[PDB]
């Protein structure tokens, strides 16, 4: 059934938020919206369709990405041990925002494609319980 405000799809409840937050504030925010709440996880094409549809009709005029729950867990700028010449990787000089280890959907690709983006960005999202 799902609570007023949430929409149902094969056993789960979803709710889009046109709120701008970092991946971490979003995920935490989602946990506070429902028991067992998290940023939306997409485990099938049918579910991906259902999410794209929800985003299309509810998150507009934001010119941003839409947070999904898939990301690299740690805070590393990367997970590469050596350069192509075999030498070890020590020195590193990343622009904070150039390390894109979080995923978000975008209007351009019909909110059906996962784009690598900086977790520090402040984008809208969708929660799922």
């Amino acid at each position: 059934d799902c609570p007023s405000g949430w929409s149902s799809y094969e056993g789960h409840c979803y709710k889009p938020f046109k709120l701008y937050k970092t991946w971490d504030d979003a995920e935490r925010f989602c946990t506070e919206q429902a028991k067992g709440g998290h940023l939306v996880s997409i485990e099938s094409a049918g579910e991906a369709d259902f999410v794209a549809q929800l985003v299309t009709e509810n998150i507009q005029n934001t010119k941003s990405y839409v947070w999904i729950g898939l990301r690299v867990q740690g805070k590393e700028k990367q997970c590469s041990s050596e350069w192509s010449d075999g030498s070890s990787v020590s020195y590193e000089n990343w622009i904070e925002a150039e390390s894109k280890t979080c995923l978000g959907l975008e209007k351009e690709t019909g909110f059906r494609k996962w784009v690598n983006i900086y977790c520090g960005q402040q984008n809208p999202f969708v929660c799922e319980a």
């Binding site: 940023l39 997409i42 690299v72 350069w83 990343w94």
Partner: protein, 123 residues
């Protein structure tokens, strides 16, 4: 000492190229320009500075491949709801590191895309 078409800097020879190639083709190409050739790697701030300066003096405003590939593919990607990662819908499969001729900051770009690049070899 280095070949006349290359530029030396602390026991290493460097050379930028204009023909755009995806990361894989650039690296491989480098291996064919001189024994032990590969895409440039940065072990220090001064070395990177030298390479940036060279790239700019050579081609001006542009972007060049660095010797780092599939940088986040080995990271641990997972759903915050702890669901098994099975269905995939990636816009891009892998990212590679490059730098722009104006500064030594590391930036990211899909490995399948194209860019200019710098090759390098030791002694």
């Amino acid at each position: 000492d280095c070949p006349s078409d290359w530029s030396s800097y602390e026991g290493h020879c460097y050379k930028p190229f204009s023909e755009p190639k995806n990361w894989a083709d650039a690296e491989n190409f480098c291996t064919q320009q001189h024994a032990g050739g590969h895409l440039v790697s940065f072990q220090s701030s001064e070395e990177a500075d030298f390479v940036v300066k060279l790239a700019f003096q050579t081609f001006g405003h542009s972007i060049f491949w660095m010797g780092l590939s599939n940088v986040w593919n080995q990271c641990n990607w997972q759903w915050s709801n702890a669901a098994m990662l099975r269905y995939k819908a990636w816009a891009e499969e892998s990212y590679c590191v490059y730098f722009k001729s104006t500064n030594n900051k590391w930036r990211s770009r899909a490995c399948r895309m194209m860019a200019q690049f710098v090759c390098e070899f030791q002694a």
